[PDB]
């Protein structure tokens, strides 16, 4: 159970974004129905008033929280991968428009899942803004908690993969547009019961054998990281 408070740009807090530049749900309940419109931008997808100004090469840091800002972020039980997708605001999330900018499942070195490191990072994880057409975008951050993904939601609606999904409104001003955004996958649509990473037993199987749901990270992605980039407590 977790939500996005707002974003930092190049280590500068853009202030509370909830229902402002983040299309926030009314609460931190998970999305589990793979075929639902709710897979797009969660249970309350609608144009909100603001869109954060950024440029290609900026570091965009999403900040997640549980109850209060900078609390315990998400429950330690919610082991799983983190992904960021991008779509043109044009789409409003509809059609084959989502391009993956980032994927992080399990780090063998430190033996931590993306979610484990997100708790350590005070809920902060980042992507580098890619060289797409200047304009308005949604950045869709997705946490998959697998603490019950041993079942499918479609077969047992009290278990299944949990999706914590948050769309930020981002305006990309300066960009040479060296990497025009390709067509992407739909949500709902790209994740089905057979798709790998959706059904997995983290209790019986080792985390090194885990394989995140596709699609693959676009070649035009300039990567990203899970790490604190600023102190929320100094505000
Ligand atoms: O731990 C392995 C075990 O996990 C079982 O699943 C547990 C989760 O581990 C546990 O973390 C989860 O806790 C939920 C709780 O069910 C929610 O009701 C609660 O929701 C709160 C919310 O946290 C508040 O932020 C908000 O203000 O109010 C709501 C209202 O209820 O949130 C917590 C997580 O923070 O409970 C699960 C029980 O299913 C698996 O079933 C089992 O297979 C695993 O072995
Ligand atoms: C899942 O979502 C679809 C599409 O909105 C809906 O028709 C269906 O009732 C939901 N499935 C379950 C298991 O509730
Ligand atoms: Cl839960
Ligand atoms: Cu939860």
UniProtKB/Swiss-Prot annotation:
Subcellular compartments: Secreted
Annotated residues that bind Cu(2+) are located at 1, 78, 164
Q: What is its main location?
A: secreted
Q: Which domain of life is it from?
A: Eukaryota
- Glycosylation, residue list: 33, 110
**What is its cofactor?**
Cu(2+)
In which residues is O2 bound? 147, 162
Q: What is its EC number?
A: 1.14.99.56
Which GO terms label this protein's molecular function in UniProt?
metal ion binding; monooxygenase activity
Report the top EC class in one word.
oxidoreductase
* A biological process from GO: cellulose catabolic process
Locate the Methylhistidine modifications and list their residues: 1
PTM remark: The catalytically essential N-terminal histidine His-1 is post-translationally modified by methylation to prevent protonation of the histidine side chain, and protect the critical active site of the enzyme from oxidative damage.
> What are its applications?
Lignocellulose is the most abundant polymeric composite on Earth and is a recalcitrant but promising renewable substrate for industrial biotechnology applications. Together with cellobiose dehydrogenases (CDHs) an enzymatic system capable of oxidative cellulose cleavage is formed, which increases the efficiency of cellulases and put LPMOs at focus of biofuel research.
Disulfide pairs here are 41-167
Alphabetical UniProt keywords: Carbohydrate metabolism, Cellulose degradation, Copper, Disulfide bond, Glycoprotein, Metal-binding, Methylation, Monooxygenase, Oxidoreductase, Polysaccharide degradation, Secreted, Signal
How its function is modulated: the record gives: The polyphenol cinnamtannin B1 contained in methanolic extract of Cinnamomum cassia (cinnamon) acts as an inhibitor of catalytic activity.
Cofactor binding: number and manner: Binds 1 copper ion per subunit.
What does it catalyze? [(1->4)-beta-D-glucosyl]n+m + reduced acceptor + O2 = 4-dehydro-beta-D-glucosyl-[(1->4)-beta-D-glucosyl]n-1 + [(1->4)-beta-D-glucosyl]m + acceptor + H2O
Q: Which PANTHER family match?
A: ENDO-BETA-1,4-GLUCANASE D, PUTATIVE (AFU_ORTHOLOGUE AFUA_1G12560)-RELATED
Q: What protein family does this chain belong to?
A: Belongs to the polysaccharide monooxygenase AA9 family.
By what name is this protein known?
AA9 family lytic polysaccharide monooxygenase A
Native organism: Panus similis
The upper taxonomy is: Eukaryota, Fungi, Dikarya, Basidiomycota, Agaricomycotina
Q: Which gene encodes it?
A: LPMO9A
């Amino acid at each position: 159970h977790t939500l996005v408070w707002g974003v930092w740009v190049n280590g500068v807090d853009q202030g509370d974004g909830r229902n402002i530049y983040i299309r926030s749900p009314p609460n931190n309940n998970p999305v589990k129905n793979l075929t639902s419109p709710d897979m797009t931008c969660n249970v309350d997808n609608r144009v909100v008033p603001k869109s954060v100004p950024v440029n290609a090469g900026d570091t965009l840091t999403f900040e997640w929280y549980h109850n209060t800002r900078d609390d315990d972020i998400i429950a330690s039980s919610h082991h799983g991968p983190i992904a960021v997708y991008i779509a043109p605001a044009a789409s409003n999330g509809q059609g084959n428009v989502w391009v993956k900018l980032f994927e992080d499942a399990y780090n063998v070195t430190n033996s931590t899942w993306a979610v484990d490191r997100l708790i350590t990072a005070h809920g902060q994880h980042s992507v580098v803004v890619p060289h797409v057409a200047p304009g308005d975008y949604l950045f869709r951050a997705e946490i998959i908690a697998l603490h019950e993904a041993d079942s499918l939601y479609s077969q047992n609606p009290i278990r299944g993969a949990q999706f914590y999904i948050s769309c930020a409104q981002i305006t990309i001003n300066s960009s040479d547009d060296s990497t025009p955004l390709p067509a992407g996958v739909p949500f709902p649509g790209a994740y089905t019961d057979s798709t790998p990473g959706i059904q997995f037993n983290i209790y019986t199987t080792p985390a090194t054998s885990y394989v995140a749901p596709p699609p693959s990270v676009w070649s035009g992605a300039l990567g990203g990281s899970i790490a604190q980039v600023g102190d929320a407590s100094l505000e």
